Design a protein around this ligand. Structure first.
Ligand SMILES: [Zn+2]
Ligand SMILES: [Zn+2]
Length: 52
């Protein structure tokens, strides 16, 4: 992986926050690995980008 990303935007499909446990809503998703998360996930999320 290389560098993460965080842009405020809404998803055009059902998503899910890997930091919390249920679907995800309009939050911040990385447009490189496909990350997504609410406000409880802005401290552990910024440090990863492993996408296959
Ligand atoms: Zn990323
Ligand atoms: Zn979350």
């Amino acid at each position: 992986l290389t560098t993460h990303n965080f842009a405020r935007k809404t998803f055009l499909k059902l998503a899910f926050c890997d930091i919390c446990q249920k679907f995800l809503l309009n939050g911040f998703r990385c447009q490189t690995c496909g990350y997504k998360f609410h406000e409880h996930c802005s401290t552990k999320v910024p440090t990863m980008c492993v996408d296959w």
